[PDB]
Design an enzyme around this catalytic site. Structure first.
Site, PDB file in Angstrom:
ATOM      1  N   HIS A  32      -7.689  -0.785  -5.236  1.00  0.00           N
ATOM      2  CA  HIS A  32      -7.538  -0.348  -3.856  1.00  0.00           C
ATOM      3  C   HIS A  32      -8.511   0.771  -3.496  1.00  0.00           C
ATOM      4  O   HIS A  32      -9.163   0.725  -2.451  1.00  0.00           O
ATOM      5  CB  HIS A  32      -6.104   0.120  -3.597  1.00  0.00           C
ATOM      6  N   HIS A  49      -5.767   8.970  -1.196  1.00  0.00           N
ATOM      7  CA  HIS A  49      -6.120   7.584  -1.456  1.00  0.00           C
ATOM      8  C   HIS A  49      -4.897   6.751  -1.782  1.00  0.00           C
ATOM      9  O   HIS A  49      -3.844   7.279  -2.135  1.00  0.00           O
ATOM     10  CB  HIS A  49      -7.120   7.506  -2.621  1.00  0.00           C
ATOM     11  N   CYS A  50      -5.042   5.440  -1.653  1.00  0.00           N
ATOM     12  CA  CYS A  50      -3.953   4.531  -1.955  1.00  0.00           C
ATOM     13  C   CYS A  50      -3.806   4.505  -3.477  1.00  0.00           C
ATOM     14  O   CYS A  50      -4.786   4.685  -4.203  1.00  0.00           O
ATOM     15  CB  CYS A  50      -4.285   3.135  -1.422  1.00  0.00           C
ATOM     16  N   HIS A 102      -3.830  14.544  -2.582  1.00  0.00           N
ATOM     17  CA  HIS A 102      -4.101  15.516  -3.645  1.00  0.00           C
ATOM     18  C   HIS A 102      -3.715  16.916  -3.179  1.00  0.00           C
ATOM     19  O   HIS A 102      -3.616  17.842  -3.984  1.00  0.00           O
ATOM     20  CB  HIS A 102      -5.587  15.517  -4.042  1.00  0.00           C
ATOM     21  N   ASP A 125      -1.593   8.697  -1.594  1.00  0.00           N
ATOM     22  CA  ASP A 125      -1.551   9.801  -2.547  1.00  0.00           C
ATOM     23  C   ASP A 125      -2.370  10.954  -1.979  1.00  0.00           C
ATOM     24  O   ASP A 125      -3.586  10.843  -1.835  1.00  0.00           O
ATOM     25  CB  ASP A 125      -2.162   9.346  -3.881  1.00  0.00           C
ATOM     26  N   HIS A 167       0.847  -1.185   0.000  1.00  0.00           N
ATOM     27  CA  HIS A 167       0.000   0.000   0.000  1.00  0.00           C
ATOM     28  C   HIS A 167       0.885   1.238   0.000  1.00  0.00           C
ATOM     29  O   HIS A 167       2.101   1.150   0.163  1.00  0.00           O
ATOM     30  CB  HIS A 167      -0.882   0.026   1.255  1.00  0.00           C
ATOM     31  N   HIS A 174     -27.000  16.599  -2.039  1.00  0.00           N
ATOM     32  CA  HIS A 174     -28.208  17.394  -1.879  1.00  0.00           C
ATOM     33  C   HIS A 174     -28.783  17.148  -0.496  1.00  0.00           C
ATOM     34  O   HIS A 174     -28.853  16.009  -0.044  1.00  0.00           O
ATOM     35  CB  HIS A 174     -29.251  16.995  -2.928  1.00  0.00           C
ATOM     36  N   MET A 192     -10.136   2.313   0.176  1.00  0.00           N
ATOM     37  CA  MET A 192      -8.900   2.932   0.629  1.00  0.00           C
ATOM     38  C   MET A 192      -8.712   4.375   0.174  1.00  0.00           C
ATOM     39  O   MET A 192      -7.890   4.675  -0.693  1.00  0.00           O
ATOM     40  CB  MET A 192      -7.705   2.077   0.200  1.00  0.00           C
ATOM     41  N   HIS A 210     -27.922  13.093  -5.416  1.00  0.00           N
ATOM     42  CA  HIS A 210     -29.209  13.245  -6.077  1.00  0.00           C
ATOM     43  C   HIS A 210     -29.529  12.464  -7.340  1.00  0.00           C
ATOM     44  O   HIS A 210     -30.427  12.844  -8.096  1.00  0.00           O
ATOM     45  CB  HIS A 210     -29.583  14.719  -6.269  1.00  0.00           C
ATOM     46  N   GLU A 234     -28.976  23.889  -4.612  1.00  0.00           N
ATOM     47  CA  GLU A 234     -29.968  22.886  -4.253  1.00  0.00           C
ATOM     48  C   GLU A 234     -29.196  21.573  -4.322  1.00  0.00           C
ATOM     49  O   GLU A 234     -29.351  20.687  -3.478  1.00  0.00           O
ATOM     50  CB  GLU A 234     -31.147  22.881  -5.247  1.00  0.00           C
ATOM     51  N   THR A 235     -28.326  21.490  -5.324  1.00  0.00           N
ATOM     52  CA  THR A 235     -27.499  20.315  -5.567  1.00  0.00           C
ATOM     53  C   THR A 235     -26.197  20.793  -6.193  1.00  0.00           C
ATOM     54  O   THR A 235     -26.188  21.803  -6.896  1.00  0.00           O
ATOM     55  CB  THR A 235     -28.199  19.360  -6.554  1.00  0.00           C
TER      56      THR A 235
END
Ligand SMILES: [Cu+2]
Ligand SMILES: [Cu+2]
Ligand SMILES: [Cu+2]
Ligand SMILES: [Cu+2]
Ligand SMILES: [Cu+2]
Ligand SMILES: [Cu+2]
EC number: 1.7.2.1
Lengths: 332, 328, 328
Positions: free
Chosen positions: C138, C128-129, C93, C91, C88, C248, C143, C299, C272-273
């Site tokens: 993964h 994330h992996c 971002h 990462d 494993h 939403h 993960m 939604h 709203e969304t």
């Protein structure tokens, strides 16, 4: 209300280049408006789209998938001579999302094998736009066969950040993302065809599943990797134009960011800052500006990791330079 | 004190048309009264005659566009005739509380209910049925529409200056999941209830069999094409209560777009295509500059030209040679 | 010199809760120490008892939310116990360089590693992996998680004015692709490795079998429903490391939303969304005005009510009849 005399405008000819590269141009315009002349020859051709040798009947603008990136400035006129050699078998045309009227030019550019036509339109809106073939009744078939590209209409004074300050790139790359729907036989193997026409029925069936068999950059899996990886150096400002003429995508630079991003690609809008990932809607072209600060390999991908690492929407950036332990470092 | 506000009764009109209204508010807050009758009915959704048991608001898919101004109080009388067979309700995305109103508007056949809510936020919003345990089934059966809550001083551009439309159209995009038998043919049912199981299975594939504008393939084409004239400013409200869409005017643009539809936000300019998330209503403003035919589509071209998400604009006026021409 | 910066230790909390922190920084930059232990474990993801071999950061799906401020240095000790079977890494971002740190944090069972990176950009980010050659496997095994890098002076509205939340929740949305046999029944595996082939096959359909919040269908309901009170300001951080989603709040809104989660950008108002692209983390700020039950959902109502992307809020307080009410 009176007509504008276009015969007085100076003219300049452009020699297009194959993606991800971009033909010569200036960011800040060095002249006033011009009629920019482009010529593209339609080419139906077999294309290998994956590492297993899968082949399809690609429909291209100038022999490549995606078609080449065209670059002009706001208020220039785009004059395209579109040629359809008699060696082709299908009807084609072109729809410029940057254009106003006649279905983006599609209603004025229908050409059968052996014919040609010249379209001219005023680039009234700055931004990156998608262009693609669109024959009535067979639109998605042509587009998903690779017949799409993009055009960048730069503001005459170049790119600007959210504060109206200049954003100047050192390099520019055009990444065309393509969703393919290769028909499969009852056994589950990709089918082969003698001519494009022979595959229509199966193609339509494959498309309606809304499930791509391949999603790639520059026409094929791994096209932008290895010896064909994109390149840059620490300190370099890079602009990546990304288009998807038929399906949503979400670009992401692994290890980097989109410092300044025009997700839906229209420059009259300030860019979004520090994006990790951005959504480019199907039928749209977007642009991301980034300054590399770390050397090494970067993966440029569609962040639906399955679409990227399984289906093919992944490319590489090989960056030179000195490592910055302040920004990141392994602690012993 | 709501009792001191003027009360006005509105007569809703079938989409893509919209009931008469003023952009810049003519009065202060009001209680705007609407009435909609729920109608379960069979509907042909494609050129092959495919039928479904549609669940509609006022007999149409989508339901009509309701229009009010920011801070008005919407008062809806929702009627469920005893001729229907299912329980229904309504969820207004423009409302605050009780699951958008769904928890207060449950009505069995033969019952009716009146809901009132303050439209505190300006923009276009989705409204749809949401019966506990069967929400997507009703929504994907066409039971959804939209409501536009205009700013009291009308629409504004990115510089805070007025934007006035000459025409407005409401395009409701609908994703349908018609069940098929082992042969691959669409199945027919005597009642909506008979199809529940098959419906659920069909929806779970996440692959629509149809994606249409105004309830059916080609509904906004031919004699029913939308219209405009060169020089006219047109606002196109677009909603999708369950799935993402990406509207695009072929031959045109979205000069000013509120992709997720909320007017307190400045519009995005010069859009070629914009993303309206499922469960959202968006709005695009455009001034036509060329006459002729335009296609208005969901730009996933398969969804548009194969599944049905495409409409047409027929525009009158004189051609502009400067903007575009076939070179001599 | 980082050796000059004071260090602070953080005790992570299991989602949807978030570890304590100051919104407005009370001191200058700091080196914030975090520790996470990788745990591969069987996990029941639906009400039918379906199990999968989940790959987790700290034993949960999603991994815990890490919180620091712009320009702090994030120092994470990543442990991969010999009780696990796969390699494993992680990462971020939010980080700059070496594939988000993936190329520097590879750890096989029985190993650990410590990575440090400067949080130069404010916003919520996904982590994330990403093991070369098996990334989606993964990530879609659960993960992934998120990290929030708050502006040193806290959150601000579209006018530069402060936005202070009383509560913060982290909702990790997960798309699962559980393999099925010819009969259509979910398959069982003795180890993660044995499922790879079927896993890749199931993923390539691009059709999730499950889409859930906090690791399982109904995970955020009942005694695990999120809570709030009328008048409370709540920030909901939402992430999806692999697939698009469209959050939403039924009965509510996103008063201030950073859909793509980066704070140097003004938030979108009155949503709203909103669309959170796969591989992104977003944040929505809302002030509750009505008590009762609310449903927080993706939604696309099918993905929500059929596949599992739905949770609940239980809100205390007095009902506001001015905002909404059932008429006589
Ligand atoms: Cu073509
Ligand atoms: Cu197009
Ligand atoms: Cu209903
Ligand atoms: Cu809703
Ligand atoms: Cu892992
Ligand atoms: Cu990532």
């Amino acid at each position: 209300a009176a007509p504008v005399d276009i015969s007085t405008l100076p003219r300049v000819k452009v020699d297009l280049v194959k993606p991800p590269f971009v033909h010569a141009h200036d960011q800040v315009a060095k002249t006033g408006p011009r009629v920019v002349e482009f010529t593209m020859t339609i080419e139906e051709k077999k294309l290998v789209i994956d590492r297993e040798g899968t082949e399809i009947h690609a429909m291209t603008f100038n022999g490549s998938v995606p078609g080449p990136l065209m670059v002009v400035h706001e208020n220039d006129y785009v004059e395209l001579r579109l040629i359809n050699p008699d060696t082709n078998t299908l009807l084609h045309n072109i729809d410029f999302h940057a254009a106003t009227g006649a279905l983006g030019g599609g209603a004025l550019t229908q050409v059968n094998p052996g014919e040609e036509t010249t379209l001219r339109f005023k680039a009234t809106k700055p931004g990156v736009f998608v262009y693609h073939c669109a024959p009535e009744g067979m639109v998605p078939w042509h587009v998903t066969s690779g017949m799409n590209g993009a055009i960048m209409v730069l503001p005459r004074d170049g790119l600007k950040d959210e504060k109206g300050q200049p954003l100047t790139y050192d390099k520019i790359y055009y990444v065309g993302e393509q969703d393919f729907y290769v028909p499969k036989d009852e056994a589950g193997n990709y089918k082969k065809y003698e001519t494009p026409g022979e595959a229509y029925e199966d193609a339509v069936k494959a498309m309606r599943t809304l499930t791509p068999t391949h999603i790639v950059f520059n026409g094929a899996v791994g096209a932008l990797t290895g010896d064909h990886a994109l390149t840059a150096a620490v300190g370099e400002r890079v602009l990546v134009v990304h288009s998807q003429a038929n399906r949503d995508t979400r670009p992401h630079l692994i290890g980097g960011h989109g410092d300044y991003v025009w997700a839906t690609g229209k420059f009259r809008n300030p860019p979004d800052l520090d994006q990790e990932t951005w959504l480019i809607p199907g039928g749209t072209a977007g642009a991301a500006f980034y300054t590399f600060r770390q050397p090494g390999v970067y993966a440029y991908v569609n962040h639906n990791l399955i679409e990227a690492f399984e289906l093919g929407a992944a490319g590489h950036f090989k960056v030179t330079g000195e490592w910055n332990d302040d920004l990141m470092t392994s602690v012993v």
